[model samples]
Each structure stands twice: as structure tokens, then as C-alpha cells.
Target: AEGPVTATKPKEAGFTSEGLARIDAYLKNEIQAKTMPGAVMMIKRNGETAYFSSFGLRDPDTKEPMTAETIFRIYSMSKPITTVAAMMLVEEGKLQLDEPVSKYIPSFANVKVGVETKGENGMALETGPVKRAITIQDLMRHTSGITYGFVGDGLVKKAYIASNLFDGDFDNAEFAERIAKLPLVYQPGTTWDYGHSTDILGRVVEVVSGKSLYQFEKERLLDPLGMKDTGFYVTDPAKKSLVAEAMPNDRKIGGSEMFDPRVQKKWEPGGQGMVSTIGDYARFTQMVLNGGTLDGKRYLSPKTIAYMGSNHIPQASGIVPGAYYLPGPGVGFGLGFAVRTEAGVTPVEGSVGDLSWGGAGGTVFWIDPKENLTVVFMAPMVSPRARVWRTLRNIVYGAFDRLE
Candidate 1:
């Protein structure tokens, strides 16, 4: 069902006609099945964008078309951005990964580990204090023992939910204070339970840099990368309107309307807060792919880039199970990214050293050093199982012939 697609080839750069046809098929199948409202895909190699395409509607009900410039929420994708922000300070010798977080944010000095205590009704109660303080590295790898308030099945989860830590009402500092009151789910560096660790890292950034998280990021990372579209809040009235609404999983069946864009009330969340477009985020990824240098400006050293992509977690006690045997076995977590240890383990076509990560709202970006390629997939859908993402990855990977 491919249409009359015009092929645009840049010197030694361009996807084959057959490759583009497969991608079209994938996107059409996704939309026809009501899996996503729409999506944008871009492929860049050797500093040139070879393939850029948009599919389906932006708002299925309104029939608004998706475009190359459509904006996305990019939830956890913001984690890597914040990680880079923190590393800028590290590069400046202002912060160290092994340093105790309490060294900067003294409020974390007394964080305790949760231990079960007996309750009078024959139910187990919980107590605190079984571990040392969490370090900066723990926060980066999500081994900090922080628990998400959204998951409230156990004692630590209950404490997290009851704390009202991320009620969309608390400022960064206020949220940090509430989080500090809760005990770690496990001893530091023992396990991985995704939570507010990155938010805490934002606090650490503020304390060490003596600047607000927004200010530091603007001065150090965003501006340098020429990422004008990225920011904590969408300020311009016109640009603000471009913000895509998040539809709940159930809403995909054609029930509720897309969420309306509004001014965010709380301080920008360093962990899950950031609005960007495919073009803008591609530039950011390009910089990372270029070893932290873009357009002749170096934000971080090549060594630092290597460090950020290297797995910091040891296999015996790492957070991700089967860490040593997957397609990317020997793969581990880095400062703020996922390192691919086994080339065959990763779903995408790349070398063992390539790294990548995505956000909750279906935004994915990856850098393959061996191929000198950077690819991004942006959409406004939430599929926790990542079925569509895996499908898209396979399509893209199949498009490329073996790189010499």
C-alpha cells in the first residue's frame, strides 16, 4: 500500500525504496489497528538526516494530521538530559559520582532503609534503618532504593504513596523534603526500583552548581546544543498549543478526548518533565553521538561520553535481571544511559558499545557508534509492554544493510 513516495538521497545517505515501503506498512498497520494516534520517525547517519516521516493523525477524533515538528512529552527521556546536565558539573569537577548525596543535599544525610516490624493484628509492620546513605551513582543507575508513589502494593510503596511526594502540587524542594521522609526500599546500591532519584539528582545539581536546575541546564547543555525548543515549561502561547495531549491506555479505544495543554503548576520535574520535538531532540542525540561535541563545541570529553555509556552495575547484584545473558549481555547501566554489552542482544542494529533510551510517551532515540547513526521515534502513546516500539525498531534495523 505504498504511495508515490519521492526518494531524497544525500551523498551515500538515503534509505532504499524497499526499506521505506516496509516502514510505511508498519505505520499503517499500527494506525489501522488503533495502536497509536500517530508517530514521527527520523534516521540520521554521518550528520545527515536520511529518512524523516510522519504517519497517521495527531488527534484521531479531530483528524489533525501528525507532522515532522509535532511536540511530545518525552517523559523518562528527560532523565538522560538531566544526566547530561549533572555530568556537565562532573566534567567541571563540581560533583563526583561516588560522593554521598548528603554531601550536597544534607537532608539525605539520615535516609534509612525500610525493615519490617511486627504489628499487633498479626500483620507485619515496617521500620527504618538498614543501610548506608545513597550515593550519586545510585541515583543515576536507579539503585538508590527510591520507590514510585504510583505503585502502592507493599510497605515502601505505601509510604511512597502516603507521602504525596509527587502530587503535582509540590515544588522541587518541597517534593525532595517529602521524599526524604520516606525510607529506602533496600540498602543503597543493592537493587533497582525506579522512582524520584533523578529528582533528587536535580536537587544535587542545584546545590552544587548554586543555580536552579533550569538555569544550569540552559547555560550548560540546551543552549550549547542549539536545542531552542526544549524547556521546563512551554512558555510561548503558540508553541504551547503544539504540546500533544496524553491519552490514557483505555482511551485508545475511542472513548475520552485527548488531554488539553495547560501551564504546569509545579516546578519542572527533572526526571519526567521536558517537552521537545523530533528535530530538536535529534540534535541532542547527535551531540551525544558525536562524543558530547556538536558544531565544534565540546560539552563533555570523549572519555566522559565513554563513561556515561559504560555499564556501572555489576552483573551479580544489578537491578535488571538476566543482565548477563540477554542480546546485550554484559550490558549494564551507565551514568544516565543504557549500555549495550552484546551486539546481538540489542533489538536495533548496532555495535556492542552503542547506547540508547526512550521516554514513556513513545519517544525513543539511539546512537550506534559503529554505524555512525542516530535514529529517533516520537509518538504520543503509552504502551508499557513496548510492543509498537519493538516493531518500529525491527523495521528500522532491517532497513540498513550491514555497515562496513
Candidate 2:
């Protein structure tokens, strides 16, 4: 579907005018405080926008004013989109969640787990057989045992760094092969190790669909939804100016250095290599909020969307989250997005069953099914994510004038 056509007044949207003002003030204050260069935020309930605004400069160096069409390097937020594509394949019977990944990527069949052991080097990684094969569901849920090399300091992470997986020009197929050669941080289905799982899933999509990740996604999701400004990179030279940038000093996200979106690359990493605008992503969220359909077209069945939004890694599964579990407390991993399991456990204001996930470059979107709400915040700052998200969540929930 297209983006929200008109914003309803805060009062009409079940939000207090005063509370909405607080949100505006808080976002403006962040720009004044130099917490971030600039940001664009949107809030919608019942499929009508309640609030939409932009603040600060899109690039402080160029003095470009932030706008709703400003594009951002969504980073890991691409995971959710990739997973949705995989699920669509599952719905079509082209892929099966329970099937072993090796069925698509043969190298995955020989993948091994890396067990840390004491040795002359203080600690060394020892290879062990995977008790169970990594399944398609494992990739979607981040249980594929892949490690980003930068998300942690474990032996597998070290090996990943040594492999120089990111140093060459390679597509998803080659990238999957390189990852398959590395030792897994944890056995498949045993732990929630967030890394190249979605990236590999993207490769699986290509293998099954006989199309590049972007090609498959464009034909299946983006084109139908009218998401004109989302892709692996900004291909249009004119749109280059709309690409948002971080402050000069805030270019790195964790150990990985951020890249310029203007430079197109062959790698369409499903986990961390897509750029999108607030308006463009808002449509994607709306489709998800509406249970996988938009503009009278059904992208996925409602039941499939609900299953994707529900918590897949419950406590009963004994699937311990990895060291850098991004979901935090009161949340669980679903197919792609993070599923809220409790209202009060994480000290954040949210409803149970809300699906959320944020990018490393300070972009986040959440859909609250219970409230029929969808919120998206776009910024380029790498740090201060938690603080900004907390403030945004609190102010948004604070604006709710009526309980469902």
C-alpha cells in the first residue's frame, strides 16, 4: 500500500494533544542537544497517522534539512524483510521451515560447531559435530549458529574475523559458502546466535527463487507495496542527496564500519545492507500490521503473519540467547521481528505481542497489534539507541488516551 495519505488529529487518533506535544518537544530537544544529527518519526493507529514530523539536519555537514523522504541505512532491520521473504516462500511450498539448510546450500551440511577449550593460547576453538542440522526455521529465528565476528569476542567470532569474510567482492552465494566454512559459535537450534543467519536465508531465497535477493524481494514485496525508495543501496544519483548520514565522529556501528550508501555493491546482505525511507518503510509496516495484506492484495496469509509475530523461542525450548541478545528481557525472537512477551519486564512502555526490531544505525519500527498501532523512527546515530528508543516508546505510550 501507499503511505498514510493524511494524518488524523491526535485527539481523533486516541492520543492526547498534550502528549503528542511532548513527543515533538522531546525529538526537537534531541536535535538541540546534539544527541543525533536529525530524525524523522511517524505514529499511526487504526491505519491512520496520528503524528508525523522531521527534526534537525539530514546531514549536519551539508546542513540538509531532515525530511520524511530521507533514506537511511537500515542495517539489521533488513533481517525482518528477508525473513518475511523466506516465509512467503514457505507459504508457496517452495521452502519448508523444518527442512535442513543444506538442501539449499550444500556447504551448510559440513558446517561444524566451535567449542572453546583451554590450551597454550589460553583458549582455542575445537570443532565438534552438530547434533542436528541447521534448519530453515533456524536461519529465520537466528538459531543457525552463525556469528558476526563483531557481535562478540568468542573463539568462533575470532575465526570469523580471521576469515576476512567482508574483505572481498562477493554475492550472497559466495558469502554463504565462506560462512559455512567457519566454525559455528553454537550448535544449531541450541542457542540464539545472531549473525549471518538472515544473510544466509537471503541466499536460500535466491537459490529457491532463481533470483537475486533484491530481485526476488522487489518482485514479491517492494513493487507490490509501492516501496519506491528501499533497496540494497541508493541507485538513483538524484536520491543520493536524500541519503541520511551520521555525524562525522559517529560512523561506526560496533566493530563494523558504516559504508556510504551512494556506493553500490554486489552484496545484498539480508541482515545489514538495505537503505529505506520513513515513508517507504511505513508502508511495509502497515502491510505487516494489517496481517500481510495492503491495498486489497494479500502478500501473506493472516495466520502466517501472526505465527511470524509470535515468540518462537519460549523458555520451554531451552534455547538460550547468545551473549549479545538484542531482544533483551520480556521479548523473544520470532521469524524476523522481536516479539514482546510481557508488558513490564523490560522497563519499556509497550504492549504484549508487539513486533519490533531496530537497525544498528538508529532506525526502529514497532507494530502493536493490540493497540492497532505502528511507529517508525529514523536516525543515523549508532550509539544512544537504547536511550532514544526508551524515550520514543515512553512518549508514544504516554500519548495513548484510551485503553483497548
Candidate 3:
């Protein structure tokens, strides 16, 4: 509970050595099969690291070994951190979850929802006004109508790509403005469609804090959590070699190629733009596991942490998830993390209240408050298989020796 996440014996942490070895065996086999070039896995239970390992080549071209210090493109994993930063402002009364996004970014007031219709020729997209304003809560829960340009084939998606969103360099402010110009794929609060909502939320953070997203996060969370290597990108040339790279043939993430972390960019996307080593990210995860505190410093109240982990996307609200919903069945989207609702519904192992999420780059992390466990796995592969997440969860839970 005191020092930086340190290792302890598996038995001491209630995990059987042989059972945990299955993880190492599985990862090694995957590496040998080239499913991923390399991976770093860390498992902590009751404030102790029961297991931690790095495997295979970090960069196949250079024959570099993957180490605990290897920085990874954490992609969507950045969402949770951004959400936490926003919530910090919420705690300070600087931001309100139910407040409309238009309060912070005026352009959001003019955004419209895209309505698709079948015409004699083909599909037609019509624009309509939002039934409700896009609130800070909607953004955190991904209920904002905003959609990723690469996620869908609707007219709105095409418009998103056709816009200036990806064509030029833009910071969070410009990015938000560009996104506002595009039509929304769904009505705000009616559907859970993941996309630029968090990125816009980051813009709101910047506007309210009068600081860049990274600057605000570093001052409030990253610096205090000792996440020295977590940032929008790795700018240091000395640490350039430590960044993990995907295999030569496995670089595409979602609709575009995986971003190069070494190349600095102006757009600090809250949903996808961030990099971190396993060690650095573990500290962030540990801080969440510790109920918004690490090293005796409080970042948020334990009640706020519990509230963020609770399910926010309730079916009772008539809010349905999209076709490509990443939370899967038996899980609900919380403020940022995906909260497990039923233990038996999903084949993945965890208790009912497990807060979990992953990146497009084969990175996954989960905090199981019920089991007092926090696990993180990092690999730089793109569009990673769903089987990998299930296997990791099963193996970690299978390694448990005693039931709390």
C-alpha cells in the first residue's frame, strides 16, 4: 500500500504459481506464432504484484526485446484517464456532468444528428436537431451522437472523413470545432456510439482549465501518480527506442494506420492519442484500484470512484448500444470503464462490478474491486482478436487460489 507497485509471491497474493504459469505459456505461444511481436503483462492483487512479465521481441526489425519499460500506444485506453481528469474538475465544481457541452464549446450548440432513410436510389441521410443537449455525462458514457469516421458506413461517417478532422493538424480545440461541423450518427443520449465524444470532452477540459489537455492531466493526475512515461506522445529522443512497434504486417488500427508515437502531433485525442509503458500505466491503474488515491494522496473521493465504476448506460433509459459496441453482452458502459453486470453472462472471468476496457492496440486492463485485483496487458498489435481478452481474463482468474 506504500511504495510503487512491487512484486510479491503468487501464493502470498492468493494465486497458484502453476496456474499463473499458464499465462506465460499462452503469451509465449502467441508470440512465437506472431500473433503479436511481444507483450507485457502485470497482475496485482490486494496491493501486491502477484505476476509481471515481458516476452518476445519488441521490434522484430531491430530484434529489440520487449521490456517493462517499453512504451505502448494505448489508444482507447486513454479514454479512462481523460474521463478521470474531467471528473476531477467535476469534484472541484468547475465542470458538471449534466451540463451541456455547448457551455464549454459553443460550437456544440449547432451540432445536428444524422437521420438515415431509404430512398428510391439508395440510402439518404437527413439532418435533424438533437432531442437533448450533449451533456458532459453523455460524453463520458459515450452517449454523445458523435461517431468515429472509421467506425460506420453511414453518410455521417463519410462526412466525418470528408471533413477537416483528419486532413490537417489540429489541436483539441480545432478538433472539437471540426467534429461539431459534422453530423452526429445518433441522437444524443439515445444510443451509445463510441467516437469523438471523449476527445471533445478533453477539449472541454482544456477550455475550463485554461490549459492543454496534457498539461491539465500532468498537473492533476500523471505527475502525482508517478506516471512519468504517460503522455500524448514520447518526445524524448533518448526514450524513442523504448517505444513498442507492431509487426511489419500488423499496423492498421481501426480505420487508419496506427499512429507513430515518436512523431509528435498537435491533436491530443482523449480517446486514442496517448502512450505509456506497462510500469507507468500500472501506477495509474493502481491509483484507480486504490479508490482514486496513491501514495496517501487523494485524487478523488472513494464515493466518486465507486460512482464512476457503476453502470451508467442503463437499458431503462431507452438507450441501446450500437452494433459494434465494444462493451459486449452483460456489460454496461460506466463513466469511462465498462462495468460487468453479470458474472456468468460473459465467458471472461470477473465479478459483477469489474471495471474493464482495452485499446485498439491489443492493450487491456481491468480493476476487479470484488476480487481486489488489477491486471494490465500491453501489446502493440492492431485490431487484436477478441479471444485474446477472454483468454487473459480466464487465465488470471483461473490462477486465483482462494476465494475472498
Candidate 4:
């Protein structure tokens, strides 16, 4: 089993031997299990990367080994980035968190709630009404009654699958319009369904900033952080080689591969479609850890970063149960990240205000401000496999000698 080599003296900008070893062990286990075709894991401390390593193959069929520069789909991880972009605009007096989304997208002006019930044929049908306008904050906190369309098991799931809301073929503008046409399963601000809210947020950013979502992110976040490799589109051949190949689930090996050719040819999905490397993403995380500032450039005021990491969802109205484990007891949604409010519920021994989020393609990240820690793990795999992420979090928490 090949593993990451520990740096001998711990470079001024990288991690120590002990830290790298923990990551190496995690990667070895993942590779042996075939849970990942390849992976790039990184850890940063005090705005300097302490660890960065890769293992396995970029393309499993071609046996290409993964590298630190490998590109990943990033999936929902893009949510936090998009949220940061929105906040930057908010700080500039261009947007507000509490504002109604209809202020920007008129289609959301009078969203009707879907009322699911039994009809004459004993089949489920939906009626409309019973909620107020879905605010921008509602979208950020995942409490806007919007669902990812890919989750759930019954009628809601059927509606999601049928809508093809996230289908890559639709451009961003068309995607938002199509999503608004769908009936929301719950009243606004009533439940946690990880659906098309971020995509809508992207449109909001475009509307307020007078710039395309990609251009706005590039100017405000990526360029400032020196994240040259992070972007909505990739044209460089070398970087394109870094893009990891999507994999088939273990149970459906002889059936059909999950990577449909038609989907591959679709438009870039702002909600879940961005390619980035471990190094570049680490820079982005480090900036958040540094309170929205990097290299002496203040992208957002410290207060705004605090708000971004705080639990925006009131305790009285907790996020719907079964929304990705809730991080732990006091953990709740901030603008776009998950905040850890209690020690026992989330179960990590990090600081009280630690916050983070991850992507669907076996990726995870977190910012522990109290401990000055930032960690990111990237891999290419579908849902329902938990071993890699669990081990990744365990290693990070174990690294801390003291947690306040």
C-alpha cells in the first residue's frame, strides 16, 4: 500500500511528520478499500499549509496516480464559497442577508408551498400556499423549504427526480427559473432540504453585483486568495488532467456507470459544479480561518466572518432532523457553513465556534478558529460510504494537543 511521505524537518509552509503520517494512514485505508479512485488531503495551520499529499489514481481505468494538483468536482463545497461571495457583496452595501430573494429574482416573489395529500385515486397530490416569502437567509441556512431534489424517498423525491432541476444541460439562468416553477415541499423557513438554494444564491449574487457569478467570484475571492486553480470552468490541459474520474457504485458494477455522457456535456452547475485543487482550496479555507482576510487584504470585515460562522437558525426553530447529522448538539447553520455550538452533540474536541462544510464527492473541510486549524479532504465517490470522512475528522481532532 503506497502512502504519503512525511516531511523530515517540517517546512516553514507545510505540516510535520506526525501530522502527515495520520493522513497517510487514512489514505492507505481508503485506497485499499477502493472507496476512492484517488485522493488529495491537506491541512493548514496559522495560514500556512502543514500537510498536502495525494494517493491512488486519477483515472482508475488508466491507473494514473493522484497528485496534490489533482482537480475535483467539489460539489456542495461550492456552497460556502458562494456564500462568501454573497457576504462580500453584502459588506459592500450591495446585498442583505435578511432581504427577500424576490428582491432580486422576481420568480420567487410569490412562491407557493406544495401541499401533498391523497386524491380520489389514492395517489399523492400537492396543493399550494401556507408560507411567507423565502428570504435570502432562508436559502443560506437550508431552512428555506428547498430540498436538493436528489434526496428523500417518496413524492418529494419523485418531484425532484422528475424536475431535473440540477440537470447540467440547463444554464444557470434557466436552472433558476425551472427551480422556481417547482412547488416547494414545505413552508418557507420551515425545514432543511439541501436543494437549489445555492444556485438561486448564485443568481442573486449576479443580480446584485452586476457581474456574472463566475466573474464576481474570480474578482473578489479567487484572485485575492491566489486561487488560480479554482474556477467554474477549466481549459488548461494540465489542470484538466487533474480532474478525477467519476466512479460506479460497488453494488451496480455490471449495471450502468453513474457518469452519463449527456450530463457531462451540460452547462457548468454553480451549485455543485466547480473544480479545485487541495492547495487552492486550502488557501480559500485559510482565508476564512483568518477571518476573511489573507495577505493583508481584507475581503470581508471580521464581524461578517463571525456572522458567517455563527448559527443563524434560531434554537426554537432547529433545522429539520436528519439533515446530515447536524454536526453535533449545538451545531447549526450559519450563512453557508455549519457551526458547532456544543461539544458533545458534534463530538469533535475543537473550539466552541468552529465551523465548516463539505462536498458530495467524498470531500470535507472545517475551520477551528480557537485552535487556528483548517483541514480539507478530497476524494471521488458517491453517497452512502462513511468510512473515509469519519477517519478524516478523527485524525484532525486527534492532532490538537489543546482545545479551548
Q: Specify the highest-TM-score model's number.
A: 2
Q: Model 2: number of clashes?
A: 0
In angstroms, the error of model 3 at 275 is 0.5
Candidate 1 lDDT by residue in tens digits, 275-319 = 888878988888888988888999889899888888776666455
List TM-scores for all candidates, in order: 0.88, 0.97, 0.96, 0.88
Worst 10 contiguous positions by lDDT, candidate 2: 1-10
**Per-residue lDDT over 1-404 for candidate 2, one digit per residue giving the tens place of the 0 to 100 score:** 01222456767678898888887788778878777888888998966789888888888899888888899999988998998999999999999999999999999998889898999969888899999999999999988898788875887888888888887678999999899999888889989878889999999999999999999999999999999899998989989999888887777875666887888889999999999999889899999999999999999999999999988899887798888887889999889988999889988899999999899899999999999999999988987877898889999999899966
Each prediction's total of clashing residue pairs, residues at least 3 apart in sequence or on different chains, is 3, 0, 0, 10
Clashing pairs in 2: none
Q: Give me the overall lDDT of model 4.
A: 0.72
Give each prediction's root-mean-square deviation over alpha carbons.
Answer: 3.7, 2.5, 2.8, 3.4
Q: What stretches of model 2 exceed 4 Å from their correct place?
A: 1-7, 254-256
Candidate 4 backbone overlaps, count: 10
Off by over 4 Å in 4: 1-20, 166-168, 246-268, 316-330, 347-349
Instruction: Write down the TM-score for model 2.
Output: 0.97
